[PDB]
Amino acid sequence: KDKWKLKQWYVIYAPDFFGGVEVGLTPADDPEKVLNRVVEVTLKDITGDFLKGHVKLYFQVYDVKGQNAYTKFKGMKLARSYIRSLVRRRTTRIDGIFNITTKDGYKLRVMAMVIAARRIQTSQERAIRKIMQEIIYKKAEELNFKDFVLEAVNGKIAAEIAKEAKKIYPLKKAEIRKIKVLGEPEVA
Amino acid sequence: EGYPAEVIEIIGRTGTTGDVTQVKVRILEGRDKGRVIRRNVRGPVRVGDILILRETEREAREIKSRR
Amino acid sequence: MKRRPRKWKKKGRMRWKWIKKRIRRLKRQRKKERGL
């Protein structure tokens, strides 16, 4: 029916700090409806190196100035197939979840996951979690929202846990599993 | 409507009463023209035959480890 | 009720869980109807 013919294709754009690039097309009648639609594109669709194909990003639009949907970072997540294969018997996963804030005033919740190399005690398992909290909060003091996110998904906080914790028990594959923004600064 | 296929190997006897035979055919003119699939036939079959079929996509379910 | 496990054995009889339930329904009548 004509209902399809009244539609209109809009071009979505990545945020600024990932490089403004085209991401998908999208139909609708009036722009007042394309205003909270959530996209999802893997990291490799933006400056793609085949290795990080298993990291996914979320962008939510906030403006339509004439066939251009500018977005805003919303979250970040690994893929269940990926982490479904790091957890085997005799390996003792370790799980941390933190509420933090940044310079602009954004509030975030990061969920990082370490994976020891054998079976270990638990009083030796919470020392590691305290280490992780202590190098997350710190790292979230001099870095703004846009630079914290730039390296969380990138993999520049993993190489710091994987340094200070390997001196508790030799581990493998420490990394960050999920990010979700919670609130905005009232300013701006 | 006309797709012929040329048997290359027999796999065994399926059937509630030993009637049908599973066999690995190779299409020879049409959409695939070279692909290899698996189908059940009724009647007797040697190798080198030419069946005529009508879909070219059904891929009969695997048999009990051929025995 | 001071039970004895020789009677759950079901060989030449009926279930014990259902015999107890029938002894109770008689002790309820010998009590109401002038078990006073």
């Binding site: 399809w4 979505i12 097309l25 959530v38 | - | -």
Partner: protein, 128 residues
């Protein structure tokens, strides 16, 4: 650019099969087909043939409105019920690219609880 893409949600259980073709955001549908909309016997409504036909009549009407490729999302009922996809999943994915579309990444998104609520039956199952 001019490259339209989309998503295909494929919902399959022991009793039916639904194919849904939407645009890349996910919020504007294009084509939605089921299994009881083609076959007539409630026996084979979940069969592989029903999926194979519905998944063709979906692609047909979705290719005419411009879509060139499609990503895959396969789903089972999941939750407090079965977690294994029925017989229509591998059949619908295999007869969606044979119909002219391309195929990007695939994944399964069945909902899983971290020790959630209670199933049916009760302490003794379905003593059929």
């Amino acid at each position: 650019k001019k490259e339209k893409w989309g998503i295909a949600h494929i919902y399959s259980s022991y009793n039916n099969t639904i194919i849904h073709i939407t645009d890349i955001t996910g919020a504007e549908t294009i084509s939605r087909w089921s299994g009881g909309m083609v076959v007539k016997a409630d026996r084979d409504e979940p069969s592989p043939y029903a999926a194979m036909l519905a998944a063709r009549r979906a692609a047909e009407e979705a290719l005419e409105k411009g879509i060139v490729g499609v990503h895959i999302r396969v789903r089972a009922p999941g939750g407090s019920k079965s977690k294994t996809p029925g017989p229509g999943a591998q059949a619908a994915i295999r007869a969606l690219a044979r119909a002219g579309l391309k195929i990007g990444r695939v994944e399964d998104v069945t909902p899983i609880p971290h020790d959630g609520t209670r199933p049916k039956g009760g302490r003794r199952g379905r003593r059929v």
